[PDB]
Design a protein around this ligand. Structure first.
Ligand SMILES: *Cc1c(COP(=O)(O)O)cnc(C)c1O
Length: 382
C-alpha cells in the first residue's frame, strides 16, 4: 500500500551516517522496495527512499512497490510553467534542462549538457543544497537567527535568498579572488558579506567561520560537511539524470562534472552506479597552479567523493583549457556556460580522445552560466 512520505520526514533529523545508503542502492538496483509493516520502525529505509526521490513509501506486509509506484518518476512540473511562489517554482520547476550539444567528441561519445543555471535564486546548482540545508534547519532553529558559511560565490547567493525566504538572516564569507557577483548579490538579497583579501581559497576561510560561530552563536551551515548538500543532489540532480536518461531514451554510459564540495558529482555517481555500476564518472582536476572558479582539486579534502563507494576517473584541465571549451560550446550551441562547466566538457573530451570511454550518451553537469564570468571570457578571447 502507498503512503505519502512527507508525513515521515522527521527521519531526516534522526537518521545519522551513511549506512542507510545501502538501502538506497538496493532499491535503485532492483527497481523496487519492500513494504514496511511499521515504517516508523525503519527510519533508515524511509530516509533511503526520500533521498532517491520517492514521494510515497511502501506500507503493509509482504508487498513491494516499484520506483514508479513510489514516485521516483512522477512529473512535478506544471505544463504551463505557472508557479504560486518562488520556492514552489524552485521545487516543482524541475528537472533542469538536459540539452544535447552539437559538439561531437571522438569515439562516439555524444554530449548532453545539464544546465544548472536554470535554478531561480543563484542561477546555479547551489540553489539545491541551499534549499535542502535551510529547510532542514527550519524546525529546530528559531526564525530571525543568523546562518552563515564560506562560499566561492554561488552558495552564498543561494544561501542569502533562501535564508531570507525562510525567515533567517545570512552572512557569507568569501576569499578576495571570488567573483564580484558573489560579493555583491548577497547584499542585494539582505545578507551581510565578509570578504577576506588574504584567504587563498574558500576552505581556507572555514577556521575563521567556525571561530566566529563559537563567539557570535550563528549557525554555521557548512556546505563542505553538511549531508543535506549531498542529499539534495541525490533527490534532485542525480534522480533527474536517471529519469531524464530513461524517458529521453539515452544510452547512458557516464556523467562528467566538477568538484567544489563534491556534493552534486558524488550524488550523480552514487545514484547512477547503483542503477548500473558500469556508468562512468569523469571528474575535473583543476591543473596545479590554476584557479577555476567554484572548483578545486580532490586531495584538498572533500567528504562524499572520498567516503562513498563511488568509481570515478580524474582528468586534469587547466583554466585556459576550461575557457577554450567555453568558447567552443558557445560557438557550437549558442549556450554560454561557466568555467567549471567548460572544464567538465574538456575533461570528458580528453577521456574521449584517449579511447577510455564507450560510445553512447554522456551527461555533463554545467554548474552555472558564463554570463557571470565576463573577465575570464575576455582573457580567453585574448
Ligand atoms: C559549487 C560549484 C561547483 C561544484 O559543485 P560542488 O557540488 O559543491 O561539488 C562547480 N562550479 C560552480 C560555479 C559552483 O558554484
Amino acid at each position: 500500500a502507498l503512503a505519502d512520505i512527507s508525513g515521515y520526514l522527521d527521519v531526516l533529523d534522526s537518521v545519522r551516517g551513511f549506512s542507510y545508503l545501502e538501502n538506497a542502492r538496493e532499491v535503485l538496483r532492483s527497481g523496487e522496495a519492500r513494504c514496511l509493516g511499521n515504517p516508523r520502525s525503519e527510519p533508515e529505509y524511509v530516509k533511503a527512499l526520500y533521498v532517491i526521490g520517492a514521494s510515497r513509501i511502501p506500507v503493509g506486509d509482504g508487498c513491494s512497490h516499484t520506483l514508479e509506484e513510489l514516485g521516483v518518476f512522477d512529473i512535478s512540473v506544471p505544463g504551463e510553467m505557472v508557479f504560486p511562489s518562488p520556492l514552489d517554482f524552485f521545487e516543482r520547476g524541475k528537472p533542469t534542462p538536459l540539452v544535447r550539444s552539437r559538439l561531437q567528441l571522438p569515439n562516439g561519445v555524444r554530449v548532453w549538457l545539464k544546465l544548472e543555471w536554470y535554478n531561480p535564486f543563484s542561477l546555479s546548482v547551489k540553489d539545491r543544497p541551499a534549499v535542502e540545508i535551510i529547510s532542514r534547519l527550519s524546525r529546530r532553529v528559531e526564525k530571525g537567527s543568523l546562518v552563515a558559511d564560506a562560499t566561492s560565490s554561488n552558495f552564498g547567493v543561494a544561501l542569502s535568498a533562501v535564508a531570507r525566504l525562510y525567515g533567517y538572516r545570512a552572512r557569507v564569507y568569501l576569499p578576495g579572488a571570488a567573483e564580484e557577483f558573489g560579493k555583491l548579490l548577497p547584499r542585494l538579497l539582505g545578507a551581510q558579506v565578509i570578504v577576506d583579501p588574504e584567504a587563498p581559497s574558500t576552505v581556507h576561510l572555514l577556521p575563521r567561520v567556525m571561530k566566529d560561530s563559537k563567539n557570535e552563536g550563528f549557525v554555521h551551515v557548512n556546505q563542505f560537511y553538511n549531508d543535506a548538500n549531498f542529499e539534495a543532489h541525490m533527490r534532485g540532480t542525480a534522480r533527474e539524470i536517471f529519469v531524464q536518461s530513461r524517458r529521453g531514451g539515452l544510452a547512458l554510459r557516464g556523467v562528467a562534472g566538477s568538484l567544489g564540495t563534491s556534493g552534486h558529482m558524488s550524488a550523480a555517481a552514487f545514484y547512477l552506479q547503483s542503477v548500473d555500476p558500469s556508468i562512468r564518472a569523469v571528474l575535473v582536476q583543476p591543473a596545479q597552479g590554476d584557479s577555476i572558479p567554484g572548483i578545486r582539486r580532490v586531495e584538498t579534502g572533500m567528504l562524499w567523493i572520498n567516503m562513498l563507494d563511488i568509481s570515478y576517473t580524474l582528468a586534469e584541465v587547466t583554466l585556459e583549457e576550461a575557457m577554450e571549451a567555453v568558447v567552443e560550446v558557445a560557438r557550437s550551441d549558442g549556450l554560454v556556460i561557466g568555467p567549471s562547466g567548460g572544464a567538465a566538457v574538456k575533461a570528458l573530451a580528453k577521456k574521449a580522445a584517449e579511447g577510455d570511454l564507450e560510445p553512447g550518451d554522456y551527461v555533463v553537469v554545467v554548474p552555472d552560466t558564463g554570463f557571470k564570468y565576463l573577465s575570464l571570457v575576455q582573457n580567453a578571447l585574448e
